[PDB]
Design a protein around this ligand. Structure first.
Ligand SMILES: COC[C@H]1O[C@@H]2O[C@H]3[C@H](O)[C@@H](OC)[C@@H](O[C@H]4[C@H](O)[C@@H](O)[C@@H](O[C@H]5[C@H](O)[C@@H](O)[C@@H](O[C@H]6[C@H](OC)[C@@H](O)[C@@H](O[C@H]7[C@H](OC)[C@@H](OC)[C@@H](O[C@H]8[C@H](O)[C@@H](OC)[C@@H](O[C@H]1[C@H](O)[C@H]2OC)O[C@@H]8CO)O[C@@H]7CO)O[C@@H]6CO)O[C@@H]5CO)O[C@@H]4CO)O[C@@H]3CO
Ligand SMILES: [Cu+2]
Length: 56
C-alpha cells in the first residue's frame, strides 16, 4: 500500500535511464534513485527519491 508516490516537483530526464515526470504525477516504486513506473505514461526508469512523497 506504501509504494505509490507523487511527484512534488517537475523533473526532466538527463540520461537514458532516468524518467521525466510532472508535479502531481504518480509513480509506483518497483538509495537516492529509485526504479519507478509512471502511472501516467507507464514508462519505467529511475527517479530521484527526494522529488517524490508517499501518495495513498
Ligand atoms: C484502445 O483501448 C483498448 C483498451 O481499453 C481499455 O484499456 C484502458 C485502460 O483500462 C485504462 O486504464 C485506466 C487506460 O489505460 C491507460 C493505462 O492504464 C496507463 O498505464 C497508460 O498506458 C500506457 C502504457 O502503460 C504504456 O505501456 C504505453 O502503452 C503502449 C504500448 O507500449 C507498451 C504499445 O505496445 C501499444 O500497445 C498496444 C498493445 O501492444 C502491447 C496491443 O496489444 C496487442 C494492443 O492492445 C490491445 C489490448 O491487447 C486489448 O486488451 C485485451 C484491448 O485493450 C483494452 C483494455 O482491455 C481496456 O481495459 C479496460 O485493446 C488494446 C488496443 O487494441 O494495442 C495497444 C495500443 O497500440 O500502444 C500503447 C499505447 O501507447 O503507453 C500507454 C499510454 O500512455 O495510459 C493508458 C491510457 O492511454 O485507458 C485504456 C484505453 O484507453
Ligand atoms: Cu505498500
Amino acid at each position: 500500500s506504501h509504494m505509490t508516490f507523487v511527484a512534488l516537483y517537475d523533473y526532466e530526464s538527463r540520461t537514458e535511464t532516468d524518467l521525466s515526470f510532472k508535479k502531481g504525477e504518480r509513480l509506483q516504486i518497483v538509495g537516492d534513485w529509485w526504479l519507478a513506473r509512471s502511472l501516467t505514461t507507464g514508462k519505467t526508469g529511475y527517479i530521484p527519491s527526494n522529488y517524490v512523497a508517499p501518495s495513498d
